[model samples]
Target: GPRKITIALLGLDNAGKTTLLNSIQGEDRDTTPTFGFNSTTLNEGKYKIEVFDLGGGKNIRGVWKKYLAEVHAIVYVVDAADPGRFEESKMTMAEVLENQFMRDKPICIFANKQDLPTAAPAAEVVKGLGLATCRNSHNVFPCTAKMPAGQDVDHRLRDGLKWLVGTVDREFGRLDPRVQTEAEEVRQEEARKKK
Candidate 1:
């Protein structure tokens, strides 16, 4: 059986990342951007997915690289309405792609807040965010994170995540053995250091 895959959510503050995780959690709870991480483990068979909502604060973004070594994929949520942040988003996203630990990993970007009239369209957001330049296979998903009551906007979110996890499950074999066995390798390395 293939091992579990870990996905980390990354983006700027108020990008509605916490809310997106709640949709995946499928239960309404107190969602807040009060910290740097929120997590949930999802599964059925080989390669259960562990999701982490790593808050996109300056204090924490630097620490994201630590998680990258352990992450199988990255989901970058963008506030489509705030094109102002697009450049910053590009900088951060590029940083992730450039990480040697994250080499060639898949990434999914959600152009969130599509429900807002002022929000940028999905393609425009992709172009505006300069996502086309990314070396890894990158995808842009258009979703309204906070929707009007009783509408299945996050089916949009669900579908996108499904694709992300599925792609990783299929493509991960092409990645490094060290990454495939990251946890075991970490423990072994520590034992060697201790010895």
Candidate 2:
């Protein structure tokens, strides 16, 4: 069987995390505020993805760190229109980087809601987040989830996810040898039980 890759989405309240999730999932259903965490699976080729959407409120932020160990990648969503909150966004990014679970995990930031007139450009948001300064390497993606009449935000979002999935898979693929060895040991133990 193919391996499952876990991706977590973290950000501040009203940061468009939920909207991005819905857009990615291709659904227009009403998305309520996430109290803690919720997951949805997306199967692409040989990879299975469990997308974790985490809440951004003070009470729920604590819960987001608990799943860091299991995450293979992270999608940090930010509201491009909220330039005033750039400092807060920077702090959040720092917090994720400081966590032991995310030190090496691949990260991609989504500067969502670009359809709005006041939305910040991708370059400014990326610089503000200090993604360039982070020693731990990751990819930063700027996206808009709004479905404007002529805009293709959906395509942009999907392409971004596809690229992120491919990038993480390629990097992690190099570790399959060790992973297979560990899996073989578990299988042998199970075989012994059947005998």
Candidate 3:
């Protein structure tokens, strides 16, 4: 893995974001609330991938903005089975996609919990979240991130990650420099305010 890429996973609480990470890492265990930072790394051929999970609970959600400029891409997970939070998810997603540093980044939306009978289809999620109108290069993958004990990670989840990784790799020429430059901008801004 010669090249390194980092992705930020964001969404409202209880959206199966952590589950998706666990599923991919082949870990099956109970997940607790995360109000701080968590991360995972994986190596794929010539790439080293890092994913960060900043707890999405409303109280700590604002933290996402601080790290946006440093990440290579974003994955926003939504609970397709929970219709009650659609509007809230939509608003959060809009704020994220509209952030200055996120404008040109590749985005992957996971309409998670597809195993639930009440889960909405990917198209419905795309519409509900206003993703259809977004200009970013994005894709919505309907998936159930909770894999059964003996089963492999959901194929849909695997496919989505592949798309994200490939997009980042292909776009690194421009994306890499932008991230570094923007990250430094954020760093200096924070330091200036520390005085």
Candidate 4:
């Protein structure tokens, strides 16, 4: 049976996270920046995937961990052409990956905006994002989220998605119980705080 997986997209501002979401969903709409979050549930191949696209603004980044408790995997987008903030992006990703709930989960890094001349190759991003230091299963893929209006989704993006779903599927036995437990804890904490 196909299992459902929840994935969250995290990155700094202008990293093209929303654009990647639009690409995966096969929507050609012009994307406005994310204010808080955008969530979508859709089927990709055999998996029922729910994606949470969170805002990448500095102030909004703090909201990322609050939602991490329920997700099974993460798709962290990096604007490949924008080298100026790789350090900042690295730190932001480190913060998320360091959270207790994120331990051992699969992470996919999308080196987005590959169409640009300045875009870095996937290897450079892998080094810059400190993937070697990360304890979970992870991979870096170069892709361009923005495509011609009539084109199909980029194969690179699809490949990245495939890797993510496959990794989660392979690790489901361990990931499922952990995700459920973390989600339950978050719910309980929220309920207690509401009193």
Every model's TM-score:
0.86, 0.83, 0.95, 0.95
At residue 137, what lDDT does model 2 achieve? Answer: 58
Residue 193 in candidate 3 has what lDDT? 66
What would the per-residue lDDT of candidate 3 be over residues 1-195, giving only the tens digit for each residue?
A: 188888999999999888888887767778888879789997655678888987889999999999998988999999999988999999998999889999789988999998899999988998889887898899999998886677777889778888998888898999999998998988888887657
Between the candidate structures 1 and 2, which one is better when assessed by TM-score?
Answer: 1
Candidate 1 least-lDDT 10 residues: 27-36
Give the top-scoring candidate (lDDT). Answer: 4
> Model 2: runs farther than 4 Å from truth?
149-153, 174-195
Clashes of 2: 0
For model 2, where is the 10-residue window of minimal lDDT?
Answer: 174-183
**Residue range 103-150, candidate 2, lDDT tens digits:** 556677788777788888778887889877886656656677767655
Better of 1 and 3 by lDDT: 3
lDDT of 2: 0.76
**Order of candidate numbers by TM-score, starting with the best:** 4, 3, 1, 2
Clashing residue pair totals per candidate (backbone < 3 A): 0, 0, 0, 0
Model 4 over residues 40-121: C-alpha lDDT tens digits? 9878777899999999998888999998899999999999999888989999989998898998888899999988999999
Rank candidates, lDDT, best first. Answer: 4, 3, 1, 2
Least well predicted 10-residue stretch by lDDT in candidate 3? 42-51
Give each prediction's root-mean-square deviation over alpha carbons.
Answer: 2.9, 6.0, 1.4, 1.3
- The list of candidate 4 runs beyond 4 A from truth reads none
